[PDB]
């Protein structure tokens, strides 16, 4: 059985979040949690919250027994960007992008 949890419009660039996603691709949830607990990165908190939400969904809605779950799939997409202005020298102006991302996690007992 597949259970999915998502976090859309997360305030972070996709490239920075992708460094943490591959740390746990294919592991068991029990070791994925404490792997995520001891990395000093901002995106680790977001990915950990998504993973815990997925585990709770997989426990409540469908069957129980989270002792044999695995991270079957995980990937990060790109959300819409917000555009701003930053002044520069001699009267010029520059465009700033604030990128977002979508985070998806799939777990399965099988």
């Amino acid at each position: 059985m597949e259970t999915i949890a998502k976090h859309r419009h997360a305030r972070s660039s996709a490239q920075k979040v992708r460094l943490v996603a591959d740390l746990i691709r294919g592991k068991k949830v029990s070791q994925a949690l404490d792997i995520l607990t001891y990395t000093n990165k901002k995106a680790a908190v977001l990915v950990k919250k998504v993973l815990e939400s997925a585990i709770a969904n997989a426990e409540h809605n469908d069957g129980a027994d989270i002792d044999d779950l695995k991270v079957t799939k995980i990937f990060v997409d790109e959300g819409p960007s917000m555009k701003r202005i930053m002044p520069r020298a001699k009267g010029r102006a520059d465009r700033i992008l604030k990128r977002t991302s979508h985070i998806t996690v799939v777990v399965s007992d099988r």
Binding site: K83, I85, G91, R92, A93
Partner: peptide, 26 residues
């Protein structure tokens, strides 16, 4: 809650000059 809005501006195209000597002057 409020929705996000963007704005923009263009320069006057200031007349910059090449203050160093000419490339192949007289």
């Amino acid at each position: 809650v409020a929705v996000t809005v963007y704005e923009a501006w263009r320069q006057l195209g200031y007349k910059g000059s090449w203050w160093w000597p000419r490339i192949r002057g007289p």
